[PDB]
Amino acid sequence: DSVVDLLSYNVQGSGETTYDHKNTFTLSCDGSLRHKFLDSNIKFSHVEKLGNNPVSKGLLIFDASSSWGPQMSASVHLDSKKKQHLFVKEVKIDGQFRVSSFYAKGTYGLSCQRDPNTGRLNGESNLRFNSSYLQGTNQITGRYEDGTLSLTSTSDLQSGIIKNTASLKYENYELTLKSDTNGKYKNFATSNKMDMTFSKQNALLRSEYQADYESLRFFSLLSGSLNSHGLELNADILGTDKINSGAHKATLRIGQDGISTSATTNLKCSLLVLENELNAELGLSGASMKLTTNGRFREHNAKFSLDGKAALTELSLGSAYQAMILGVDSKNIFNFK
């Protein structure tokens, strides 16, 4: 208490906390701060029925008011009760925020219904957010039924410029996930759809995606299946445009019989075409390698390929190439064992 305003204020708060031996509990926390630039109102009530009827009530009362524009407030309403034997819970949370003109509001709503006799639960979630330059909203539905879960997610991002949806299912001790995301920005028609699967031993990988930018339709395919007996993976990716087309495929098998790799790259550019084939098998009969490459431009042809076998009994590598480039006869052979 002083003649000067800024030197005068109020600061106080009661943090009451008491448990009733009756198996009932109550928590009270009051916050009130009085100052010449800001005015804070804080009050939170928390009470728990620790005897019978396991009810839980939680309420927050908060309001702070700066005397120089900014105004803030948030409310929390926690409601959980055992309706006879149906456990009913509902939560309402809302945080509201402005400064002078900037806006920021996020409202959330959660609903949960459970039947423990049947081991079944119904979870429903609502999310919405708004601001001066940002819009956010998402919904989640969770269905659990006595060991069986069915969860689904739908997300809208910045007014839906990007759309994402995730589907998950876990039944019979085997997991399956599906996940999709798609772009709606500028010239990008990007769309990725991802699914994952799981068995007692096997996990399966399928991944698709298309970029589809301007005139370029680029595609990537990945297929990965695994087991106790090594991996089998194929990566297949295509980049095709108005004229040019990047086409390469790679196949890799990890088997107890040995390793078989097959990476192939074919490129065509108007009057130029390129073809590339490597073929290596790392088996038990000596490593086998086979190569092929014939780059074709206009009429001119270059024809190359190489055979190769490396066995303990014998090593065989025979190289050959021929071409008529600029009409110049050209041929080389290298055979040696």
Curated annotation (Swiss-Prot):
Sugar attachment sites: 130
Stated name of the protein: Apolipoprotein B-48
Organism annotation: Homo sapiens
Interval of the full protein contained in this chain: 1394 to 1730 of 4563
